[PDB]
Design a protein around this ligand. Structure first.
Ligand code: 5BI
Ligand code: CL
Ligand code: CL
Length: 138
């Protein structure tokens, strides 16, 4: 497994038609996962499966600017299961990140950070065994 937390450099940032693929397995009794697409200290796109928020499973998406979290976007569909292998695919489109999990569309997140070519790191953290993280231009 790769060591979590794991930083994947995104050379020259992200661009439409860039597909980021994360393969891992959820640990047993997981509490959280996080993908953080970073523009220096800012978080352009935070994707945060929470396995127990007041006894519900919810995915929280948000942006952090100058250390301030913004308005959360919340999804009720929760495709992750403790102990089970997953594939997350984040496809950069012109207006949004498009996220599929296990080949099923999950959510999109509108670009709040506009300087896509400055989102040059992906942080992968939380309660996973991380198998691989890569990108390809489609
Ligand atoms: C207002 O809460 C905040 O919301 C942000 C998104 O809008 C981030 O997710 C942010 O967390 C981080 O940035 C973060 C967290 C951990 C680490 C290691 C690094 C960075 C923080 O979340 C919690 O703290 C949170 C909110 C709810 C709950 C829940 F209720 F679900 F348990 C748990 C947490 N928990 O971070 O643990
Ligand atoms: Cl590693
Ligand atoms: Cl910007």
């Amino acid at each position: 497994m790769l060591i979590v937390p794991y930083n994947l450099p995104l050379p020259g940032g992200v661009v439409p038609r860039m597909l980021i693929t994360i393969l891992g397995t959820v640990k047993p009794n997981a509490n959280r996962i996080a993908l953080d697409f970073q523009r220096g200290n800012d978080v352009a796109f935070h994707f945060n499966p929470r396995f127990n928020e007041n006894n519900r499973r919810v995915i929280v998406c948000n942006t952090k600017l100058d250390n301030n979290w913004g308005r959360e976007e919340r999804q009720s569909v929760f495709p992750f299961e403790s102990g089970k292998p997953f594939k997350i695919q984040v496809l950069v489109e012109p207006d949004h990140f498009k996220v599929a999990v296990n080949d099923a569309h999950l959510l999109q997140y509108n670009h709040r950070v506009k300087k896509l070519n400055e989102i040059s790191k992906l942080g992968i953290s939380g309660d996973i065994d991380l198998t691989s993280a890569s990108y390809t231009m489609i």
